[PDB]
Amino acid sequence: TLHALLRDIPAPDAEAMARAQQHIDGLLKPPGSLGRLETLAVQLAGMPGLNGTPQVGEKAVLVMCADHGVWDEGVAVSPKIVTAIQAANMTRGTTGVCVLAAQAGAKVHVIDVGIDAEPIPGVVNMRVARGCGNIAVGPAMSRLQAEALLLEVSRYTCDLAQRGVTLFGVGELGMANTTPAAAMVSVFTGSDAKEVVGIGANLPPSRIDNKVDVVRRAIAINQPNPRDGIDVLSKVGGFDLVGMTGVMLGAARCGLPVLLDGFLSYSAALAACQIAPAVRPYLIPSHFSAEKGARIALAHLSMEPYLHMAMRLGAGSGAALAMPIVEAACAMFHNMGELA
Amino acid sequence: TLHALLRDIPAPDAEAMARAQQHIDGLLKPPGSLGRLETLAVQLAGMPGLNGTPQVGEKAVLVMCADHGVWDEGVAVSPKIVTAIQAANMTRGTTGVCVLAAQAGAKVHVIDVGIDAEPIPGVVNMRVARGCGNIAVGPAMSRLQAEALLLEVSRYTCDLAQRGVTLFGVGELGMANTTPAAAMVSVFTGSDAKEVVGIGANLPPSRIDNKVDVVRRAIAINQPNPRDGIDVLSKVGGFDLVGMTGVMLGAARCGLPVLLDGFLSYSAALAACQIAPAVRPYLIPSHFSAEKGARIALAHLSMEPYLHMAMRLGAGSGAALAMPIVEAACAMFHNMGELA
Numbered sequence: 257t258l259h260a261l262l263r264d265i266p267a268p269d270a271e272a273m274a275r276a277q278q279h280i281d282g283l284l285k286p287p288g289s290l291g292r293l294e295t296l297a298v299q300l301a302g303m304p305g306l307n308g309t310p311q312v313g314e315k316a317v318l319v320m321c322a323d324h325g326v327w328d329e330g331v332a333v334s335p336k337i338v339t340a341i342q343a344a345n346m347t348r349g350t351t352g353v354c355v356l357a358a359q360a361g362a363k364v365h366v367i368d369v370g371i372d373a374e375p376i377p378g379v380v381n382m383r384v385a386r387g388c389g390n391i392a393v394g395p396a397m398s399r400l401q402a403e404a405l406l407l408e409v410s411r412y413t414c415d416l417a418q419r420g421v422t423l424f425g426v427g428e429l430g431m432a433n434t435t436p437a438a439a440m441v442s443v444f445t446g447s448d449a450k451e452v453v454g455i456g457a458n459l460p461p462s463r464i465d466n467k468v469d470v471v472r473r474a475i476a477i478n479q480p481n482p483r484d485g486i487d488v489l490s491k492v493g494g495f496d497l498v499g500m501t502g503v504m505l506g507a508a509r510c511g512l513p514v515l516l517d518g519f520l521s522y523s524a525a526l527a528a529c530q531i532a533p534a535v536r537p538y539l540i541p542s543h544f545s546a547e548k549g550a551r552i553a554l555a556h557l558s559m560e561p562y563l564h565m566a567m568r569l570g571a572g573s574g575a576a577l578a579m580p581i582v583e584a585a586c587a588m589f590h591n592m593g594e595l596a
Numbered sequence: 597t598l599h600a601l602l603r604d605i606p607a608p609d610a611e612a613m614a615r616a617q618q619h620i621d622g623l624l625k626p627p628g629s630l631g632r633l634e635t636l637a638v639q640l641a642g643m644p645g646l647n648g649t650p651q652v653g654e655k656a657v658l659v660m661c662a663d664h665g666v667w668d669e670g671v672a673v674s675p676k677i678v679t680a681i682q683a684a685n686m687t688r689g690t691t692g693v694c695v696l697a698a699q700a701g702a703k704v705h706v707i708d709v710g711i712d713a714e715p716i717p718g719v720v721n722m723r724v725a726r727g728c729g730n731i732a733v734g735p736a737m738s739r740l741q742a743e744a745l746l747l748e749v750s751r752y753t754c755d756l757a758q759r760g761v762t763l764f765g766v767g768e769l770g771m772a773n774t775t776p777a778a779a780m781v782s783v784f785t786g787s788d789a790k791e792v793v794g795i796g797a798n799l800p801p802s803r804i805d806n807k808v809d810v811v812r813r814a815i816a817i818n819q820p821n822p823r824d825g826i827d828v829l830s831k832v833g834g835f836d837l838v839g840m841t842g843v844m845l846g847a848a849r850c851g852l853p854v855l856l857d858g859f860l861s862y863s864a865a866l867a868a869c870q871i872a873p874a875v876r877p878y879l880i881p882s883h884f885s886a887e888k889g890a891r892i893a894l895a896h897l898s899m900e901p902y903l904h905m906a907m908r909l910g911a912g913s914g915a916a917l918a919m920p921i922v923e924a925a926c927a928m929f930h931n932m933g934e935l936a
């Protein structure tokens with residue numbers, strides 16, 4: 257059950273962490289001089305699915321794909337079918353995340369959680385419905401649909417471990433998805449909509465006030481409770497955002513690391529950590545998204561990304577680009593010599 | 597000759613850059629959404645040694661190693677022999693840069709430009725003297741020694757190309773080397789010493805005022821001319837800093853990219869770009885050093901690093917950690933599909 261999953265996420269292993277820190281401090285360098293590589297190695301050492309040491313085996317980027325009813329509000333410049341076209345392109349290896357994942361030695365798992373099109377052969381089918389409800393007039397979904405998809409995606413994630421995967425990355429695809437993301441950041445952080453609504457996929461600036469108004473309307477109509485992250489997801493999120501939260505919950509349940517992507521992912525991470533604070537030690541930032549609301553979301557997660565790429569592609573591309581940073585931390589730990 | 601080398605650094609290829617930009621804008625994504633990956637690919641396309649396209653072949657991190665007379669002023673906590681011990685460890689593959697270079701598929705070239713010890717078998721010997729002169733009482737070296745070492749190291753660098761290397765990284769090793777680095781940043785940027793002197797290799801805070809005083813003294817005694825970067829290097833730099841400048845000049849002469857490291861490298865890049873402004877399009881930042889003077893140096897180079905690792909190891913480790921970012925830009929360019 258989902259209550260049992262949340263309950264059973266392990267604490268980080270303090271003993272393992274202390275053993276890793278003592279190891280690091282004895283390496284061939286001034287103490288502390290590898291900076292956040294050192295801290296990342298210790299962070300990884302405490303994740304129980306890594307068996308007491310910083311290591312990377314297989315890598316998986318899980319790309320959650322869905323359509324959104326709020327597309328009808330005029331908040332996205334791209335036509336709705338682009339979600340389906342780009343999900344199919346993911347199965348061919350031609351998208352940004354595909355190419356970056358291949359550089360990293362990672363596999364991309366393309367997951368349809370609610371595309372408004374016929375199912376695409378080759379994509380993993382977890383579809384809740386053909387797009388979620390339009391958040392400007394009512395909820396994205398029912399509470400039950402959100403909890404079922406959390407549990408499904410969490411189980412899928414953990415099951416990859418059972419297959420060799422030690423490091424996850426999250427991403428999404430869905431036209432209009434930066435609207436619900438902004439809604440959820442506004443709810444969880446207490447920030448006004450204006451502070452967290454961006455251009456998404458090159459929305460013209462002339463259309464920004466409409467998008468702010470839509471966010472505020474979604475919130476006012478649905479009255480999401482910020483102390484119930486499931487409620488927030490269900491009311492003002494989307495199936496893609498639920499899916500990403502699910503990957504985070506499942507990785508945490510398996511005691512394994514998950515790399516965030518950009519702003520969409522930060523909104524899902526705010527939900528995951530409200531739902532289960534025990535998720536937080538498993539999350540690793542990648543990059544600092546170019547979306548307006550990035551800073552605020554990151555501040556609330558107490559996260560400082562490694563990469564400043566002015567990226568806003570999504571779909572997991574940042575996560576993939578950071579996987580060699582994680583591998584680097586593990587290589588430093590295992591392969592450096594010792595001062596003594 | 598060194599005058600001829602400087603004269604013959606090629607301009608970037610604007611045609612190649614325009615061809616790359618048009619290619620990029622046609623890739624399977626919203627225009628501009630890969631952010632600085634896009635700009636980096638176009639930057640690389642204009643470098644004539646890359647043959648009109650962003651690509652990476654062989655990779656080399658050149659680690660310039662020397663001792664400094666100013667060590668006698670009390671500005672470094674590590675004993676002087678650590679330079680020699682750590683240079684020998686570089687030949688064994690046990691240092692930070694070695695392990696990160698191996699992750700990146702790069703080779704480390706350890707170059708002795710003036711270690712105060714017997715020559716170390718296996719290290720490339722370009723030694724000017726057994727340590728440079730103490731910059732608090734006089735010059736580090738003569739003008740002629742600085743120009744000879746520039747030319748030597750520039751030629752060595754370019755000769756690697758002639759062997760398959762397309763991407764360089766720079767680093768250094770030398771006890772007390774953060775003192776001359778701060779001197780040169782102070783000279784080139786106009787900043788007071790206090791603004792740019794840091795802790796280096798974990799100097800105790802109680803010893804900082806002494807290090808500031810030493811920098812100001814070096815400057816006052818030598819009167820380096822900030823409009824003559826060779827003069828600045830020779831007077832208030834060191835052999836390691838000259839060596840790094842030489843790698844930059846040689847990479848630029850060969851029309852090839854060079855990744856910077858941390859603060860030491862930023863001081864050498866300020867010198868290289870004063871000496872030959874034509875170097876600048878070939879320089880790629882890696883990380884944002886944790887040294888105090890990092891921001892000021894970077895601002896003067898108009899550079900924004902990709903990586904925020906709070907690193908201050910040196911020796912090329914940041915450069916190595918950024919090599920997969922360069923490879924990523926090339927993979928995006930070559931392997932992504934097209935919108936059309």
Ligand SMILES: Cc1cc2ncn([C@H]3O[C@H](COP(=O)(O)O)[C@@H](O)[C@H]3O)c2cc1C
Pocket residue numbers: 331332333334338342428429430431432433434435455456457458459569570571624625626
């Ligand atoms: C070809 C294409 C590929 C993409 N991959 C990610 N996104 C990104 O942009 C979309 C959200 O922005 P908005 O809220 O402005 O619609 C999502 O699909 C997101 O990951 C894409 C967008 C496009 C157009």
Ligand SMILES: Cc1cc2ncn([C@H]3O[C@H](COP(=O)(O)O)[C@@H](O)[C@H]3O)c2cc1C
Pocket residue numbers: 284285286671672673674678682768769770771772773774775795796797798799909910911
């Ligand atoms: C074991 C060891 C390895 C290093 N590798 C780089 N550095 C770094 O620290 C030195 C300069 O700092 P300062 O000006 O405070 O002496 C250089 O060798 C630099 O790359 C090292 C320092 C130590 C001690």
Ligand SMILES: O=C(O)c1cccnc1
Pocket residue numbers: 434455456457517518519520521545546547567568569570571
């Ligand atoms: O940071 C995000 O991933 C992002 C922002 C805008 C559009 N698509 C993705």
Ligand SMILES: O=C(O)c1cccnc1
Pocket residue numbers: 774795796797857858859860861885886887907908909910911
């Ligand atoms: O950024 C640098 O590389 C640095 C700073 C202090 C000490 N050693 C290296």
